[PDB]
Scaffold this active site. Structure first.
Site, PDB file in Angstrom:
ATOM      1  CE  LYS A 248     -29.358   9.274  29.786  1.00  0.00           C
ATOM      2  NZ  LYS A 248     -30.097   8.006  29.605  1.00  0.00           N
TER       3      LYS A 248
ATOM      4  CG  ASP B  51     -29.470 -11.637  62.072  1.00  0.00           C
ATOM      5  OD1 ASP B  51     -30.615 -11.361  62.443  1.00  0.00           O
ATOM      6  OD2 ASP B  51     -29.061 -11.411  60.845  1.00  0.00           O
TER       7      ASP B  51
ATOM      8  CE  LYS C  75     -20.070   8.090  23.060  1.00  0.00           C
ATOM      9  NZ  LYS C  75     -19.371   6.783  22.978  1.00  0.00           N
TER      10      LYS C  75
ATOM     11  CB  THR D  75     -38.521  -0.999  49.347  1.00  0.00           C
ATOM     12  OG1 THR D  75     -38.852  -1.801  48.236  1.00  0.00           O
ATOM     13  CG2 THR D  75     -37.021  -0.793  49.524  1.00  0.00           C
TER      14      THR D  75
ATOM     15  CB  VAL E 233     -18.620   6.291  30.038  1.00  0.00           C
ATOM     16  CG1 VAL E 233     -19.523   7.432  29.618  1.00  0.00           C
ATOM     17  CG2 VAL E 233     -18.366   6.259  31.526  1.00  0.00           C
TER      18      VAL E 233
ATOM     19  CB  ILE F  88     -41.500  -5.254  51.480  1.00  0.00           C
ATOM     20  CG1 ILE F  88     -42.800  -5.728  52.103  1.00  0.00           C
ATOM     21  CG2 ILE F  88     -41.758  -4.665  50.096  1.00  0.00           C
ATOM     22  CD1 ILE F  88     -43.749  -4.576  52.397  1.00  0.00           C
TER      23      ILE F  88
ATOM     24  CB  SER G 120     -20.036  -1.001  63.832  1.00  0.00           C
ATOM     25  OG  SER G 120     -21.360  -1.499  64.044  1.00  0.00           O
TER      26      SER G 120
HETATM   27 NA    NA Z   1     -37.450  -4.558  52.846  1.00  0.00          NA
END
Ligand code: NA
Ligand code: NA
Length: 327
Positions: free
Chosen positions: A64, A248, A52, A93, A57, A98, A172
Site C-alpha cells: 500500500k 458529566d 517493510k 456513529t 510493517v 450509536i 481544557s
Molecule cells: Na456515537
DNA sequence: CATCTG
DNA sequence: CAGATG
C-alpha cells in the site's frame, strides 16, 4: 511529524475502517502500530521495502505504501470513500449513543440517515434518542464565555446543598482553552473516601438540585458515582436560547481528588511527562494516587495528597498553573 | 471504567 | 450475564 504524514494518515483511514465497517480488530490493530512506528521514524519513507524494514510493517502494508507513494492515491481508500454502506456508518456513529455495532444493524435495516432515524425513533434507546434530538447542539463547541456561566451555576448550587462539597471543572476549560466540547465536573466530599463505605446520595443530591433549578435537562446515565447528562443555560430574555450541552458529574473519594483532578486537567502530554518525571523522582502515578517506588521492581503505598501541590512537591517539581499544563 | 440494555 | 457506548 510531516515527513511521513500521508502515510500515517492513509494507514489511519485504513485502520479506522477495518474496525468501524468490517469488524477487523486485528487488521485494524495492525494499521495502528504501523502508523505509530512510521510515525516515529526519522526519515523520508521513499519506498515500500524501506518501510517493510520496520516492525509492524509487513508485506501488505508495504504494498500500500508503494501505491500511495507511486500515485497520489490508494484504490482501496478510494473505493471505501465512495461506498455508501461505509459512509453511513461513519455518519450514524456521530449520534451519541450509536457506536459501530449499532451503526451496522441500522444500516442493514436501511436507516442510513437522520430522517431514517427519526422515522424509527422506536428502534433507538433513551441515550440514542436524546443523542438524536440534540444532534446539532451536540456537535457545537462550547465557548468559554458559556463555560464560565455554567460553571457559575454548578458551583453555586453545589454550595447550597452542602458547604462541604468540592467541585472542580476539569478539562481544557481548566487549562485555559477558548472553547470546549463538554463539561466535567470532578466531585468529592469529606465524608467520602477510599474506605468509607458508599454514599450514593452524595452524588444524587446534587444532580437533583441541578434539575431543580433546570440546569440539567436530561439524563443519559445515572449511576452511583457517575452521572452523564444534558444541561442548559437558561435562556435569558426570549430570543436567544442556548444549545443543549453534554455534561458529566463524578463522585470521587476525597482521598484521591487531586490526582484525579490533576489527571483529568491534562493535557495527555502534560500527564505523560509529569508521569515519567514521577518515575525518575522514585514515583508512581495514575488516575487516583501517587506511590513511592520501591526498588525490588516496583512497590506501593499511597502517598498523602491535599492539593495538586502535594503531588508536584512529591516528584519535586515546578508547580504548574493549569494554563501551562499544556505540554 | 461505570452504566445500560436485553 | 456479555456486550455496547462514552
Ligand atoms: Na456515537
Ligand atoms: Na467472547
Amino acid at each position: 511529524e510531516t515527513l511521513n504524514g500521508g502515510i500515517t494518515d492513509m494507514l489511519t483511514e485504513l485502520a479506522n475502517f477495518e474496525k468501524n465497517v468490517s469488524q477487523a480488530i486485528h487488521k485494524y490493530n495492525a494499521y495502528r502500530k504501523a502508523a505509530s512506528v512510521i510515525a516515529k521514524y526519522p526519515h523520508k519513507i521513499k519506498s515500500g521495502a524501506e518501510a517493510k524494514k520496520l516492525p509492524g510493517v509487513g508485506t501488505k502494508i508495504a504494498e500500500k505504501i508503494d501505491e500511495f507513494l507511486a500515485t497520489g492515491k490508494l484504490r482501496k481508500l478510494e473505493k471505501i470513500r465512495q461506498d455508501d454502506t461505509s459512509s453511513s456508518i461513519n455518519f450514524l456513529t456521530r449520534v451519541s449513543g450509536i457506536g459501530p455495532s449499532a451503526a451496522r444493524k441500522f444500516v442493514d435495516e436501511g436507516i442510513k440517515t437522520l430522517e431514517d432515524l427519526r422515522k424509527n425513533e422506536d428502534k433507538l434507546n433513551h441515550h440514542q434518542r436524546i443523542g438524536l434530538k440534540y444532534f446539532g447542539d451536540f456537535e457545537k463547541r462550547i465557548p468559554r464565555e458559556e463555560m464560565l456561566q455554567m460553571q457559575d451555576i454548578v458551583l453555586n448550587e453545589v454550595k447550597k446543598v452542602d458547604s462541604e462539597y468540592i467541585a472542580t471543572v476539569c478539562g481544557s476549560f481548566r487549562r485555559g482553552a477558548e472553547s470546549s466540547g463538554d463539561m466535567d465536573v470532578l466531585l468529592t466530599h469529606p465524608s467520602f473516601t477510599s474506605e468509607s463505605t458508599k454514599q450514593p446520595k452524595l452524588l444524587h443530591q446534587v444532580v437533583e438540585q441541578l434539575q431543580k433549578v433546570h440546569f440539567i435537562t436530561d439524563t443519559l446515565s445515572k449511576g452511583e458515582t457517575k452521572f452523564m447528562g444534558v444541561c442548559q443555560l437558561p435562556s435569558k430574555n426570549d430570543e436567544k436560547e442556548y444549545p443543549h450541552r453534554r455534561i458529566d458529574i463524578r463522585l470521587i473519594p476525597k482521598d484521591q481528588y487531586y490526582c484525579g483532578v490533576l489527571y483529568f486537567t491534562g493535557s495527555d502530554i502534560f500527564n505523560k511527562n509529569m508521569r515519567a518525571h514521577a518515575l525518575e523522582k522514585g514515583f508512581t502515578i495514575n488516575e487516583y494516587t501517587i506511590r513511592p517506588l520501591g526498588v525490588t521492581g516496583v512497590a506501593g503505598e499511597p502517598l498523602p495528597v491535599d492539593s495538586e501541590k502535594d503531588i508536584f512537591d512529591y516528584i519535586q517539581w515546578k508547580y504548574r498553573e493549569p494554563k501551562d499544563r499544556s505540554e
